[PDB]
Amino acid sequence: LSSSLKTCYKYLNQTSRSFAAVIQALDGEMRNAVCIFYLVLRALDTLEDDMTISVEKKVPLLHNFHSFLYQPDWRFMESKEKDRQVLEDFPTISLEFRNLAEKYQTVIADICRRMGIGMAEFLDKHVTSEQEWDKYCHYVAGLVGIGLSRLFSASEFEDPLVGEDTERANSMGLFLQKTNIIRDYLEDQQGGREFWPQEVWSRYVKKLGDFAKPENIDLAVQCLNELITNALHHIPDVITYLSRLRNQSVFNFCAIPQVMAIATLAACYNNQQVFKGAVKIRKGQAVTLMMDATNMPAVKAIIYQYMEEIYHRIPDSDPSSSKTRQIISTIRTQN
Numbered sequence: 120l121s122s123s124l125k126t127c128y129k130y131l132n133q134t135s136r137s138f139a140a141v142i143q144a145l146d147g148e149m150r151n152a153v154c155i156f157y158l159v160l161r162a163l164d165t166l167e168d169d170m171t172i173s174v175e176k177k178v179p180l181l182h183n184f185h186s187f188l189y190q191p192d193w194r195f196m197e198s199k200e201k202d203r204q205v206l207e208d209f210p211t212i213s214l215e216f217r218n219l220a221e222k223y224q225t226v227i228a229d230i231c232r233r234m235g236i237g238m239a240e241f242l243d244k245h246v247t248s249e250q251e252w253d254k255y256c257h258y259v260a261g262l263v264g265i266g267l268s269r270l271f272s273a274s275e276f277e278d279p280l281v282g283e284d285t286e287r288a289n290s291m292g293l294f295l296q297k298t299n300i301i302r303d304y305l306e307d308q309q310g311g312r313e314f315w316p317q318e319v320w321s322r323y324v325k326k327l328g329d330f331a332k333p334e335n336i337d338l339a340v341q342c343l344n345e346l347i348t349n350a351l352h353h354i355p356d357v358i359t360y361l362s363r364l365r366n367q368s369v370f371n372f373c374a375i376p377q378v379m380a381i382a383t384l385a386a387c388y389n390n391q392q393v394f395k396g397a398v399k400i401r402k403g404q405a406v407t408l409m410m411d412a413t414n415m416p417a418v419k420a421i422i423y424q425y426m427e428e429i430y431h432r433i434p435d436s437d438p439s440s441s442k443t444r445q446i447i448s449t450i451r452t453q454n
């Protein structure tokens with residue numbers, strides 16, 4: 120491997136940790152394609168996330184990021200974030216992007232252009248409606264799902280339907296993103312970040328930060344349950360998406376995050392701790408999930424056991440109780 124590609128995989132291990140191994144297991148040309156897409160997305164997210172970068176500087180950065188892929192000298196030295204090396208050494212990453220077959224470069228570049236437009240749109244608004252939540256998640260995660268799917272089909276390891284069905288790929292991203300947004304309430308609150316949809320939380324409290332106060336914990340948990348029930352709606356599409364995959368290494372890459380989000384939603388459901396700290400699945404639990412998630416019967420079994428767990432925890436008085444039961448019933452009966 121070239122020095123530059125070695126450096127890319129080092130950044131992948133620094134930035135994705137135990138997830139790097141799953142990416143390194145991808146067959147043939149998919150391996151480098153996904154490694155570089157992952158790093159390019161890390162760089163874009165670092166720019167987006169950086170509250171030290173003014174809106175006037177950030178908008179052109181987000182809008183033009185797709186072009187930087189083609190600018191050998193482009194770098195960004197002013198980031199204060201944790202993964203800033205990918206920005207400071209962007210020339211090494213973009214060199215390797217330019218070394219990919221053009222069919223992969225063109226996927227990545229298009230996705231970055233579209234994601235940048237959307238990210239820029241959300242700099243001067245919080246999320247209002249559930250529809251706006253889906254739009255926000257499309258921009259930061261659904262389009263990742265779409266991009267990856269196109270790499271899978273373009274590499275010919277998966278059927279063209281995988282790349283073309285934007286809605287199923289979109290749902291892969293939305294599921295993950297909403298699970299993270301839900302679980303991360305408190306850390307976001309403390310960071311000055313608000314991603315829970317205003318249309319939903321404003322039905323319980325006056326300000327989103329009110330859920331951190333002990334007197335509102337019943338209302339906070341009801342809102343949590345409502346948002347979780349929303350995220351569960353993506354599961355049918357996740358099942359459909361995963362069921363079409365014929366390459367083992369692609370399957371494992373796609374399935375791993377999905378089963379870990381499933382377990383995380385189960386851990387968070389009706390859980391007051393969401394408002395006191397970071398609820399996480401245990402490392403040994405995550406390792407088993409990762410090892411198990413290698414075929415459809417196995418993944419469906421996992422989904423079913425965690426959905427059943429949530430089903431039996433639904434408080435009768437929960438405002439979303441009938442909605443939660445219905446989505447769980449739908450999931451259990453399709454497969």
Ligand SMILES: COc1cccc([C@H]2O[C@H](CC(=O)N3CCC(CC(=O)O)CC3)c3cccn3-c3ccc(Cl)cc32)c1OC
Nearest residue numbers: 137138156157160260263264267268291292295372373376
């Ligand atoms: C078809 O679409 C995907 C297939 C596989 C993975 C992803 C997605 O997974 C991570 C999930 C994730 O990062 N984690 C952390 C590590 C975990 C595994 C471990 O602990 O080792 C799984 C969940 C994620 C969440 C939100 C955005 N992404 C994302 C960014 C970039 C790429 Cl290339 C792919 C992803 C996909 O994007 C939706």
